[PDB]
Structures are given as structure tokens and as C-alpha cells.
Short mmCIF file of C-alpha atoms (C1' of nucleotides) and ligand atoms in Angstrom, two decimals:
data_model
loop_
_atom_site.label_atom_id
_atom_site.label_comp_id
_atom_site.label_asym_id
_atom_site.label_seq_id
_atom_site.Cartn_x
_atom_site.Cartn_y
_atom_site.Cartn_z
CA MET A 1 42.48 63.62 0.78
CA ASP A 2 39.66 63.36 -2.02
CA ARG A 3 40.09 64.95 -5.39
CA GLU A 4 38.82 68.22 -4.21
CA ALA A 5 41.39 68.72 -1.72
CA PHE A 6 44.00 67.52 -3.99
CA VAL A 7 43.07 70.04 -6.67
CA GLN A 8 42.73 72.95 -4.29
CA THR A 9 46.13 72.28 -2.34
CA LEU A 10 47.94 71.41 -5.66
CA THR A 11 46.93 74.69 -7.59
CA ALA A 12 48.24 76.76 -4.52
CA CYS A 13 51.71 74.92 -4.52
CA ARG A 14 54.85 77.02 -4.95
CA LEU A 15 57.56 74.61 -3.86
CA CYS A 16 59.78 75.04 -6.95
CA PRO A 17 60.73 78.89 -7.12
CA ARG A 18 62.21 78.46 -10.66
CA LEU A 19 59.04 76.98 -12.04
CA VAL A 20 56.75 79.35 -10.12
CA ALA A 21 58.60 82.02 -11.92
CA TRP A 22 58.75 80.40 -15.47
CA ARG A 23 55.18 79.51 -15.47
CA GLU A 24 54.31 83.34 -15.46
CA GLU A 25 57.30 84.46 -17.49
CA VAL A 26 56.17 82.56 -20.43
CA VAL A 27 52.79 84.29 -20.62
CA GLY A 28 52.55 86.45 -23.66
CA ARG A 29 55.97 85.15 -25.07
CA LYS A 30 54.27 83.29 -27.91
CA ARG A 31 52.85 85.47 -30.64
CA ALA A 32 49.67 83.40 -31.37
CA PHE A 33 48.41 83.64 -27.86
CA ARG A 34 49.54 87.14 -26.75
CA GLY A 35 46.70 88.76 -24.75
CA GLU A 36 45.09 85.58 -23.96
CA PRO A 37 44.49 84.39 -20.41
CA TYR A 38 47.07 81.80 -19.23
CA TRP A 39 46.50 79.36 -16.37
CA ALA A 40 50.21 79.82 -15.37
CA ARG A 41 49.58 77.50 -12.18
CA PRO A 42 50.18 73.76 -11.28
CA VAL A 43 48.15 71.51 -13.82
CA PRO A 44 45.79 68.96 -12.03
CA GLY A 45 45.54 65.67 -13.85
CA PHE A 46 42.35 65.21 -16.32
CA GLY A 47 40.33 62.22 -16.93
CA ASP A 48 38.46 59.11 -15.70
CA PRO A 49 38.89 58.90 -11.89
CA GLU A 50 38.04 55.03 -12.35
CA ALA A 51 40.81 54.62 -15.06
CA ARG A 52 42.39 51.56 -15.74
CA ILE A 53 45.04 53.25 -17.86
CA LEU A 54 47.24 56.06 -16.74
CA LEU A 55 49.22 58.12 -19.51
CA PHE A 56 52.17 59.74 -17.39
CA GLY A 57 53.76 62.80 -19.22
CA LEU A 58 56.72 64.89 -18.49
CA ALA A 59 55.59 68.40 -17.53
CA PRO A 60 53.40 71.35 -18.87
CA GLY A 61 54.35 73.00 -22.11
CA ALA A 62 54.71 76.62 -21.82
CA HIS A 63 51.78 77.37 -24.08
CA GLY A 64 50.10 73.98 -23.69
CA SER A 65 48.66 73.06 -20.38
CA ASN A 66 50.22 75.84 -18.72
CA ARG A 67 48.05 78.00 -20.83
CA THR A 68 44.84 76.07 -21.05
CA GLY A 69 45.04 74.49 -17.58
CA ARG A 70 44.45 70.88 -18.87
CA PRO A 71 46.95 68.06 -19.63
CA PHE A 72 48.22 68.00 -23.31
CA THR A 73 45.58 70.55 -24.29
CA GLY A 74 46.54 73.48 -26.73
CA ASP A 75 49.85 72.25 -28.15
CA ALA A 76 51.35 69.86 -30.88
CA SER A 77 51.42 66.95 -28.18
CA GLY A 78 47.69 67.30 -27.76
CA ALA A 79 46.95 67.65 -31.35
CA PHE A 80 48.66 64.32 -31.75
CA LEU A 81 47.53 62.68 -28.64
CA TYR A 82 43.60 63.25 -28.45
CA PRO A 83 42.55 62.16 -31.79
CA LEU A 84 44.51 58.80 -31.14
CA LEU A 85 42.88 58.49 -27.73
CA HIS A 86 39.38 58.81 -29.62
CA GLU A 87 40.62 56.36 -32.50
CA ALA A 88 41.28 53.79 -29.68
CA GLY A 89 37.97 54.25 -28.31
CA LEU A 90 39.14 55.88 -25.07
CA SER A 91 37.30 59.22 -25.34
CA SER A 92 34.15 61.14 -26.20
CA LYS A 93 35.63 63.04 -29.07
CA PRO A 94 38.98 63.78 -31.06
CA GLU A 95 39.72 67.03 -29.79
CA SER A 96 40.36 68.60 -26.37
CA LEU A 97 39.50 72.30 -25.73
CA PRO A 98 39.47 74.05 -22.46
CA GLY A 99 35.95 74.16 -20.83
CA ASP A 100 34.59 71.74 -23.34
CA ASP A 101 32.70 68.45 -22.20
CA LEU A 102 35.61 65.93 -23.19
CA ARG A 103 35.26 62.78 -21.35
CA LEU A 104 37.94 60.19 -21.18
CA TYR A 105 36.96 56.33 -21.06
CA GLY A 106 39.09 54.27 -18.71
CA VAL A 107 42.04 56.73 -19.11
CA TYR A 108 43.58 59.58 -16.91
CA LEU A 109 46.30 62.13 -17.87
CA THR A 110 48.95 63.74 -15.78
CA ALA A 111 52.75 64.31 -15.39
CA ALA A 112 55.82 63.92 -13.40
CA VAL A 113 56.17 67.72 -12.99
CA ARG A 114 53.09 69.79 -12.83
CA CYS A 115 54.38 73.61 -13.61
CA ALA A 116 56.11 74.47 -16.98
CA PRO A 117 59.77 74.14 -16.91
CA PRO A 118 62.44 75.99 -18.71
CA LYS A 119 63.50 74.12 -21.65
CA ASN A 120 60.93 71.26 -20.80
CA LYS A 121 63.68 70.08 -18.36
CA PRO A 122 62.94 70.01 -14.62
CA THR A 123 65.63 69.35 -12.35
CA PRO A 124 66.19 66.46 -10.12
CA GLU A 125 65.05 68.57 -7.13
CA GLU A 126 61.92 69.75 -9.01
CA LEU A 127 61.16 66.21 -9.79
CA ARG A 128 61.56 65.13 -6.20
CA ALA A 129 59.34 68.09 -5.26
CA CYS A 130 56.43 67.33 -7.37
CA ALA A 131 56.75 63.56 -6.79
CA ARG A 132 54.66 64.13 -3.59
CA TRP A 133 51.74 65.19 -5.74
CA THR A 134 52.35 62.03 -7.83
CA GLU A 135 51.76 60.08 -4.67
CA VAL A 136 48.67 61.86 -3.83
CA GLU A 137 47.28 61.84 -7.40
CA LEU A 138 48.01 58.32 -8.14
CA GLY A 139 46.61 57.29 -4.87
CA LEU A 140 43.35 58.82 -6.06
CA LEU A 141 43.25 56.35 -9.20
CA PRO A 142 42.62 53.02 -7.66
CA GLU A 143 41.78 51.14 -10.58
CA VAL A 144 44.86 51.84 -12.77
CA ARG A 145 46.29 48.44 -14.03
CA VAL A 146 48.58 49.91 -16.68
CA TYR A 147 50.96 52.90 -16.25
CA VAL A 148 52.33 54.28 -19.45
CA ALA A 149 55.36 56.31 -19.27
CA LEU A 150 55.50 59.06 -22.14
CA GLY A 151 59.34 59.50 -22.38
CA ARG A 152 62.36 58.80 -20.30
CA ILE A 153 61.79 61.39 -17.69
CA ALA A 154 58.19 60.03 -17.14
CA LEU A 155 59.59 56.48 -16.78
CA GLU A 156 62.31 57.25 -14.32
CA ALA A 157 59.41 59.26 -12.38
CA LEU A 158 57.30 56.26 -12.23
CA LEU A 159 60.20 53.92 -11.43
CA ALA A 160 60.78 56.08 -8.23
CA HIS A 161 57.25 55.76 -7.36
CA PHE A 162 57.27 52.03 -7.61
CA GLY A 163 60.69 51.70 -5.90
CA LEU A 164 62.01 49.97 -9.02
CA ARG A 165 65.67 50.05 -10.12
CA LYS A 166 66.54 51.92 -13.27
CA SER A 167 69.32 49.38 -14.22
CA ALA A 168 66.47 46.62 -14.52
CA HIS A 169 64.14 48.80 -16.26
CA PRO A 170 65.47 50.62 -19.18
CA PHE A 171 63.76 53.21 -21.26
CA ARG A 172 62.89 51.87 -24.72
CA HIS A 173 59.93 52.39 -26.72
CA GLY A 174 57.52 49.42 -26.28
CA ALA A 175 59.21 48.12 -23.04
CA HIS A 176 56.81 46.37 -20.72
CA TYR A 177 57.63 45.80 -17.07
CA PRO A 178 55.60 43.72 -14.48
CA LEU A 179 54.07 45.61 -11.52
CA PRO A 180 52.87 43.98 -8.15
CA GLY A 181 49.21 42.90 -8.36
CA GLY A 182 49.20 41.73 -11.89
CA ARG A 183 49.49 45.39 -13.01
CA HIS A 184 51.87 46.77 -15.93
CA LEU A 185 54.38 49.48 -16.60
CA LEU A 186 54.74 50.36 -20.17
CA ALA A 187 57.30 52.86 -21.94
CA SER A 188 56.59 54.84 -25.04
CA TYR A 189 58.52 57.70 -26.52
CA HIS A 190 56.79 60.91 -25.47
CA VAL A 191 54.36 62.62 -27.81
CA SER A 192 56.09 65.70 -28.28
CA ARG A 193 56.28 67.43 -31.56
CA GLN A 194 60.12 66.95 -31.78
CA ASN A 195 59.31 63.12 -31.80
CA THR A 196 56.24 63.00 -33.84
CA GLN A 197 57.04 65.41 -36.56
CA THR A 198 60.54 63.88 -36.95
CA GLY A 199 59.16 60.24 -37.49
CA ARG A 200 60.58 59.02 -34.26
CA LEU A 201 57.07 58.22 -33.01
CA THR A 202 54.37 57.81 -35.64
CA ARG A 203 50.58 57.92 -35.14
CA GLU A 204 50.67 54.03 -35.94
CA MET A 205 53.30 53.38 -33.33
CA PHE A 206 51.35 55.25 -30.62
CA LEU A 207 47.84 54.01 -31.43
CA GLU A 208 49.58 50.72 -31.01
CA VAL A 209 50.82 51.70 -27.59
CA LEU A 210 47.25 52.47 -26.65
CA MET A 211 45.83 49.32 -27.94
CA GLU A 212 48.24 47.31 -26.04
CA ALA A 213 47.54 49.34 -22.98
CA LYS A 214 43.88 48.55 -23.40
CA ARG A 215 44.66 44.78 -23.86
CA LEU A 216 46.70 44.71 -20.69
CA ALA A 217 44.23 46.66 -18.73
CA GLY A 218 41.21 44.16 -19.73
CA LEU A 219 39.73 46.79 -21.91
"C1'" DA B 1 63.17 87.94 -47.53
"C1'" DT B 2 64.81 83.36 -45.23
"C1'" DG B 3 67.32 82.15 -41.02
"C1'" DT B 4 65.96 81.18 -36.17
"C1'" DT B 5 63.40 79.17 -32.51
"C1'" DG B 6 61.09 75.63 -30.17
"C1'" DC B 7 58.99 71.27 -30.03
"C1'" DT B 8 62.90 64.29 -26.88
"C1'" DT B 9 66.24 60.83 -27.91
"C1'" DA B 10 70.65 58.51 -27.78
"C1'" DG B 11 74.80 58.52 -27.29
"C1'" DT B 12 79.24 60.91 -24.76
"C1'" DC B 13 82.29 62.09 -20.60
"C1'" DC B 14 83.16 61.81 -15.55
"C1'" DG C 1 73.07 59.60 -11.81
"C1'" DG C 2 73.90 63.69 -13.76
"C1'" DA C 3 75.57 67.33 -17.12
"C1'" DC C 4 76.29 68.20 -22.21
"C1'" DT C 5 75.13 67.97 -27.06
"C1'" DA C 6 74.30 66.46 -32.05
"C1'" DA C 7 70.39 65.08 -34.82
"C1'" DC C 8 65.36 64.39 -36.63
"C1'" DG C 9 61.49 67.25 -39.64
"C1'" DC C 10 58.30 70.90 -39.64
"C1'" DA C 11 56.28 75.45 -39.38
"C1'" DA C 12 55.49 79.79 -36.30
"C1'" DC C 13 58.07 83.58 -35.66
"C1'" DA C 14 60.70 87.55 -36.66
S1 SF4 D 1 56.29 71.68 -10.08
FE1 SF4 D 1 54.97 70.48 -8.68
S2 SF4 D 1 55.99 70.72 -6.64
FE2 SF4 D 1 57.00 72.23 -8.08
S3 SF4 D 1 55.83 74.13 -7.59
FE3 SF4 D 1 54.78 73.31 -9.32
S4 SF4 D 1 53.24 71.72 -8.34
FE4 SF4 D 1 54.61 72.50 -6.79
O1 2HP D 2 51.49 71.06 -21.62
P1 2HP D 2 51.12 69.51 -22.24
O2 2HP D 2 52.69 69.36 -21.70
O3 2HP D 2 50.77 68.49 -21.10
O4 2HP D 2 51.47 68.89 -23.54
O1 2HP D 3 54.04 84.29 -39.86
P1 2HP D 3 54.57 85.23 -41.06
O2 2HP D 3 55.58 85.80 -39.80
O3 2HP D 3 55.96 84.64 -41.42
O4 2HP D 3 54.38 86.65 -41.00
#
DNA sequence: ATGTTGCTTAGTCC
DNA sequence: GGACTAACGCAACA
């Protein structure tokens, strides 16, 4: 199917009852956004369809993409990520606002799970379910040369996608593994506020991941 | 009030 | 693998 079909069918997905419930349950639970409209639906990926770089996240944040409808948009992860994408020369502007004209250059964003999960922790079954969308979505990104896993969950999800063994591909920030066809699998700590605000992942460190991804992608 | 909640990683055990 | 939890730093939240 093409992207239009992907987005249409994805947005109507209700395979995970716990997530179908949670994505709506959180609406109105955060003071700053009470009364505001929430996407509260599966989150389609965003970015350059001809991207050479794929940034693969964990899942929608309750008041992030689950609210705005766009990956990493509206939360602390995006406040950290988007400016760095621009600093690396991979986007039209530093900020991401729903409905704006933000363009990503050579990069596409999505995640392992597409509906907000309780405690930001999807179950193995939920991951297995949404992996079907990963197959469809990644199939629509023919030019990707570098797959960047943001966090352990994201990495394990990509390993499953590529049929790679976890034992041979451990999660460590900066890890780099070869993929068939001269492609690359990179691992980075996730951009979550609890990684960036604690100093586990600094702006310097993540920008480096982006610059390396560009180098490996021929950009 | 100022204590609690919420935002992934690296150890433990099965 | 999968379930459980101590530990970061910060600030919205109550
Ligand atoms: S997480 Fe994925 S598979 Fe599960 S309901 Fe949402 S879109 Fe469907
Ligand atoms: O909701 P966001 O997860 O994609 O940060
Ligand atoms: O945000 P304030 O809750 O402490 O009033």
C-alpha cells in the first residue's frame, strides 16, 4: 500500500485494548493541556519519504505525540530533539508545532509502538502487534541507509525487524552494527527528559549521533 | 508551603 | 527473555 493507505488504516487500528484505552484515558490529565484537543489515536510517522536516516523511537508520550499527533511533538523529548535536528542541517526550522510547515531533510521519524502506553512501557504482545505497522512503514522508506534506535526498546524492535540476535547486538550508546546492503544500525540513549535532564544524554552526545548518522548515510 | 509525580537505564533475580 | 527496582536532575503539579 502507499502512504495514504498506511495512514488511513493505521489511524483506525485498535489491536491493543490497553493502549486504545490509555491513549484516551490520559486526555485532560495534565493541567497545562486540560480542555485542549488530543489526537488520542495511533501516531503516523513524520518526515522525508526519501529519507536516508530513520530515527526510531519508543512510543507516543501521553501529552506529546498522543496529544499533537506528530512524533516527538509537544513534549520534553521534542524540545530536545528538534532543535538538534536543525543544528545538524536536517530540518527547515528548530521547532515542531502541529499544523506548521516543518520539513525534515533526509530524515524520517517514527517508533516501535504507535499508541501511548501506560508508564511508557508497552508489553511484549503490544510490541509484537505494532511491529506489523513497522513492516508497512519501513517498507515505505526505500532510501533509508541508517536506522537509529532511540533507546533499548527501539533497538530490540529493530533487531526483530532485521531478524538479528540480541546476543550479538547489545544496547549501548554509540553502538554501530552493519546491515545488509551496506546499511547501518546505530544505537543511542533515548531522548527522554529523564535521560537528557539527568545528564545521561547531552545535547553534545546526541548531535554527535546525528552527525555520525549523516556521515554513514552519505549526507 | 514544599513534597510528589512524571519524564529510561543498568543492574538484579529466575 | 521477561519481571522488578534503585538512581539521575529538573520542574510542573498539587
Ligand atoms: S499500538 Fe500499534 S498495533 Fe497497538 S493499537 Fe496502536 S497502532 Fe494498533
Ligand atoms: O510522544 P513523543 O514520544 O513521540 O515524544
Ligand atoms: O504551578 P504552581 O502550582 O506551583 O501554582
